[PDB]
Design an enzyme around this catalytic site. Structure first.
Site, PDB file in Angstrom:
ATOM      1  N   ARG C  54      -7.915   4.737  -4.311  1.00  0.00           N
ATOM      2  CA  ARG C  54      -8.250   3.523  -4.226  1.00  0.00           C
ATOM      3  C   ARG C  54      -7.944   2.782  -3.048  1.00  0.00           C
ATOM      4  NH1 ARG C  54     -10.362   1.414  -7.705  1.00  0.00           N
ATOM      5  NH2 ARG C  54     -10.683   1.205 -10.168  1.00  0.00           N
ATOM      6  N   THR C  55      -6.583   2.763  -2.803  1.00  0.00           N
ATOM      7  CA  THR C  55      -5.888   2.030  -1.718  1.00  0.00           C
ATOM      8  C   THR C  55      -6.112   2.697  -0.493  1.00  0.00           C
ATOM      9  OG1 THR C  55      -4.201   1.182  -3.077  1.00  0.00           O
ATOM     10  CG2 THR C  55      -3.744   0.915  -0.653  1.00  0.00           C
ATOM     11  N   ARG C 105       2.283   5.068   2.275  1.00  0.00           N
ATOM     12  CA  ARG C 105       2.318   4.728   0.678  1.00  0.00           C
ATOM     13  C   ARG C 105       3.403   5.623   0.018  1.00  0.00           C
ATOM     14  NH1 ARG C 105      -0.713   1.535  -3.707  1.00  0.00           N
ATOM     15  NH2 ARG C 105      -0.578   2.909  -5.593  1.00  0.00           N
ATOM     16  N   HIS C 134       3.962  -4.469  -2.320  1.00  0.00           N
ATOM     17  CA  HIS C 134       2.728  -4.289  -2.151  1.00  0.00           C
ATOM     18  C   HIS C 134       1.918  -5.324  -1.533  1.00  0.00           C
ATOM     19  CE1 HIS C 134      -0.847  -1.921  -2.042  1.00  0.00           C
ATOM     20  NE2 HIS C 134      -0.992  -1.850  -3.680  1.00  0.00           N
TER      21      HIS C 134
END
Ligand SMILES: [Zn+2]
Ligand SMILES: [Zn+2]
Lengths: 310, 148, 310, 148, 310, 310
Positions: C54-55, C105, C134
């Site tokens: 997703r990120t 991440r 985040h």
């Protein structure tokens, strides 16, 4: 004559005061006088779907200690790529015609209860079914508290660590609730506290309880100090680090301890008790599991034998 | 042992609690010296029965260095020792950060098996001293970040 | 030239008031008028030590929108620089000499801050360092609220679900606390109640807040409904089933909800949003994720480019 | 400036090698007596350099316990003081067992993450020694053990 | 009367000339006269932490051959995602109260030595603990050399392949060193040569040895030809390919062999002996492992029985 | 136009004297003045059949610095073109028609040479084919020595650690052997001594060399200290522990070392370099890796572009 012959044995709630006292008295009698040919010519399955190492060898030792044969398996976390094998009703049915009794451990809760009617007249003992508590652990817990303190009534039993999720402590409180006069302490952090259904059971029977902050606050008066698992994969690592400070039982918090106090543990352990409480007279959790040989031996002889003279 | 003092420049502190003298000569690295080291560990020095001390000759310590004693030795002092006299016996004082002498309680902290130095923030509440972590940014009570 | 030039985006706490409204304005300016080749001849490493498609698709997309090269990976449980034998500090000492910026991440907390110490003159943007921070998720959250409502003040926002461990809702409560007049309704179960430390900083600034047990009470007066992510593995599957009611959000609950009200979600949903909510105009979690490319486009163009002509 | 340095009942000689007195503090845990004690680091010595004058009061050290010092410091010999009165000479003669202090250099050994007390047999080897393990049964040099 | 009753049995160095001769004589007596009810009403654990298939079934056969029951497990390389189960001191302690003896195999060296004091008066046999040699393999090796050659003294025992890391050959040389007159050949490549600690032991006892290049150089005078594993994951594939040329025992290098020569092997094998030396009178490595039934049966009867009349 | 135009970089042996000084000069020219769009409209496949996030980030970075597209993968133990069913020759026959050049890393030896046979007019650069060659690592090694010392001749270089299996140190000894006056000090244990074949080609060219047991002896006179990588899995963990002393390199050993001396490392370190060495100016292993992007930028621009204006 037989009370527990060909019985269910799935949960502690089904067992009354007269059922618990027959298993503890029979465990003290076979320990004092071993019968290595009681369950001769009788096969017992040990169907461990969930892989428990210590629990399977305490059961399979008790089977072989009475002279019975054994046929067991242990799957190392199955469910590979979605769909796997058979159903659990289809497995117990075919295993039931093979043997005279089943001793099953399942990750899902209610698996031992699913096996009573399907097995027919073949008894099935519950060795731990998910979060629906471990009754064999509760029987060897009561046997250790009885053989050292001298009784199960009028005792100051404390309970530390995981009380909300700790299954071994839930029914340890319900088993001791059937006995009278039992004072209860519940040393747990503001998270892993004892559930409201256990506390409401204690208010109903007129049993006194109270929540405490740490070990040293109750240490002055204690006959037993049950200690629980408290795994790191439950509460997040920052939360586990902060609370785990006073709840750990060091040897520095044993100066108020009574002469007959005994620390227990269902096992395993890592970050609840350090390895310096083993060289004390209060050390009594290793031989509690060894007392589980006699608790599971008494529980197997009652069901697979009409009458017994120990 | 009530007469001594006034030996070689540097400085010496007083009022080190009992069992605090040791493990302070190690966490802050002070043994790593080639001069007059005579610790006063396990020797009463006043109101309390158990107290320890430590002396150092030619070796000054920044206000910030002394303030990094507070947490451990909260009731002690610092009087610049040269030879018969004294130049302000400054007691320790809770610094605004403590590094190189505290491990983080968050096991899943990046700073544990990494080639960097520790660092915490300071603030008292009323009950304990929550030192916050530099990396994970989670805050803990001194009693927890202390031992384990 | 540019206050956020060559700065590290490790935490929301580091970003001041005008810092958050500067990247918000730059995300609204680049959205209004594309910058095809702003970060031309700039390489950016997408070092994702924790798998997150997703990120990583949202970050790498925004790199490509400004016309910037990309070279990264996904540890995906193995990675070559691990298994004890290579520190994270060594990995960043090498990646820094390769590229002009590093988006990383990590599953461990404080990993992004550790990277800044060995990066040197190479900026370090935090895509999610464990349960700590985040800020990239918080930049697209506020940017989605600033478009729909038109402001970041005097809004009746509420946060549902797991607020205890939800790192996205923690940093969002601190970022909206940097503004005035905001009303908070933390609607969670007792086991996932918002931490006291977040309720302490709110009390310091004189910001109103109130704990309910369901959305039914506050649905009349709310301009945002930031539904958070709840893991099944956070607690038991039994106590997850019950008490989860009214944190599921049906589309039959949007009867009296304000017309301008918009439902936000970090993006991974399953239980907390029903599928019938998609058809309503309230639902704005897919449009929130689409606005996530502009919040990450504003962050990169403000750290690498000296000016921001448009 | 006077120096009536404290030397009470118990044990200890001076003359112990350089950067060794603090090494004979953390390891053997001589601070854990928790009663009354004193030190003397970086001091003029007899027949060599300088350093070390460790511990005191109620700490009778056995013959084989002062052999434990031999490996680390080959420059000592116990004093059983009473009144400035020197008595009972026993020299670090190197023991046949060394327990609690050293570590097995082998990483695959199972004595590292367990509740055990280490054990190490010893035999001479041209001005040095070789400390074998009781568990690992792998004979290591007495030099790479100091590096860990 | 009992020498080895309730003894340690962890390493071959602890066993003297009088200990090895009692196990070989007892292995020849129970082979000539089986006693299927010697260890009756006695449980023995087989705690194989390291998964060895052949070694666990040679032990569990010897247990069942005397009439004892068995309770054992086999983990298939555990240490999944870093931190796993209990400590090894915590496992042996709880297993010790269950059974009368333990037979443990551990990947880490010094695990069998860690279990003597923790087990109490419960003996623990070492079935292979890392690179700290395999004593049960050494006992069945001596039993095979004694039953064919007629003795253990004055024999020309060669040893081929992995001598540096080959544990089974290390203590085979130390066991034969306690016997006199034993000539020794060490056919190994310039890499996998015998260590200096084994060669210095042989110089101390006045035992003659010599390094040889290949099998045919010593083949004229040999009573035994011990052959070792030599695994491919040890020396790199190019190095393993070059040296493995003359060291492999083909049937072409058996023309100088004596009439009473016997090739041995601890097992398994793949690229050391081809499958054409099985149809010879010198074939004697399959029934060496079968002789390990009697070596582990004699070793279990001495420890779990006060006195014996075979 | 350009001697290295459309050539394969499979081995260091193939590269002549002027070949190595030509890519060295081109790496110093592109470093002095960037070439943002030299390899524009050129696609380059990063086919890494063996996972290596160090070398793949350095290679793909240098592709992007010249403005060249990239399309590759990482087998990561599975890859779609494997598990028996697709040859490496078929994979390169397809990838060749897609891209203008192929950078491939294979676990098997001779994989890059095999690729040239099926590539056709598509160049093939070797990123590491097993234990055979690694010329890309050797190009950045010599380029780092040519900057710091200023030359590649009359240098007192030494190689520590695993020289027996170290493919990086093998090709480095052959590449520096193409120059004159170089002094070599191979400082390794006896189990990891430099192969005889490397000592044979040195003796042929009349190059001096000497085997020590530690860095303590030669540290006075050395201009480079190329510390190599040592695996724990190469040998026992016991004999790895001892004998590893003085191959660990503390920062307290740089007392008498020359001022211009610079410590080099391929990049993956853990034991062989201490963390206190980073602070000293000697340490140059992170700056060596940063110079690895220019050695790989010189290789690609010299094989795809016809001229090299600058
Ligand atoms: Zn931290
Ligand atoms: Zn060891």
């Amino acid at each position: 004559a037989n009370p527990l012959y060909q019985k269910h044995i799935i949960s502690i709630n089904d067992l009354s005061r007269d059922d618990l006292n027959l298993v503890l008295a029979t465990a003290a009698k076979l320990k004092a006088n071993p019968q290595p040919e009681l369950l001769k010519h009788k096969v017992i399955a040990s169907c461990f779907f969930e892989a428990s190492t210590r629990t399977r060898l305490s059961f399979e030792t008790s089977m072989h200690r009475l002279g019975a044969s054994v046929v067991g398996f242990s799957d190392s976390a199955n469910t590979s790529l979605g769909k796997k094998g058979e159903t659990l009703a289809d497995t117990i049915s075919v295993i039931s015609t093979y043997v005279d009794a089943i001793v099953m451990r399942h990750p899902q809760e209610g698996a031992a209860r699913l096996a009573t009617e399907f097995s027919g007249n073949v008894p099935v003992l519950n060795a731990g079914d998910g979060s629906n508590q471990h009754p064999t652990q509760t029987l060897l817990d009561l046997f250790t508290i009885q053989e050292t303190q001298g009784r199960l009534d009028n005792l100051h039993v404390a309970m530390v660590g995981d009380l909300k999720y700790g299954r071994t402590v839930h029914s340890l409180t319900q088993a001791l609730a059937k006995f009278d006069g039992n004072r209860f302490y519940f040393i747990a952090p503001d998270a892993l506290a004892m559930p409201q259904y256990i506390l409401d059971m204690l208010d109903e029977k007129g049993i006194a309880w109270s929540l405490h902050s740490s070990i040293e606050e109750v240490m002055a008066e204690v006959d037993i100090l049950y200690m629980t698992r408290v795994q790191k994969e439950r509460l997040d690592p920052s939360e586990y680090a902060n609370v785990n400070a006073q709840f750990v039982l060091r040897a520095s918090d044993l100066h108020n301890a009574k002469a007959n106090m005994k620390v227990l543990h269902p096992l395993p352990r890592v970050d609840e008790i350090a390895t310096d409480v083993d060289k004390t007279p209060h050390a009594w959790y290793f031989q509690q599991a060894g007392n589980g040989i006699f608790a599971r031996q008494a529980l197997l002889a009652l069901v697979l034998n009409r009458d017994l003279v120990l | 042992k009530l007469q001594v003092e006034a030996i070689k420049r540097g400085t010496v502190i007083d009022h080190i609690p009992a069992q605090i003298g040791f493990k302070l000569l190690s966490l802050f690295k002070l043994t790593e010296t080639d001069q007059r080291i005579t610790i006063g560990l396990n020797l009463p020095s006043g109101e309390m029965g158990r107290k320890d001390l430590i002396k150092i000759e030619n070796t000054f310590l920044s206000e910030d260095q002394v303030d990094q004693l507070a947490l451990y030795a909260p009731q002690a002092t610092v009087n610049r020792i040269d030879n018969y006299e004294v130049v302000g016996k400054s007691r320790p004082s809770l610094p605004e950060r403590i590094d190189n002498v505290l491990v983080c309680p968050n096991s899943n902290c990046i700073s544990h098996a990494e080639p960097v130095s520790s660092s915490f923030a300071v603030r008292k509440r009323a009950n304990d001293i929550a030192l916050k972590c530099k990396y994970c940014e989670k805050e803990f009570s001194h009693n927890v970040v202390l031992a384990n």
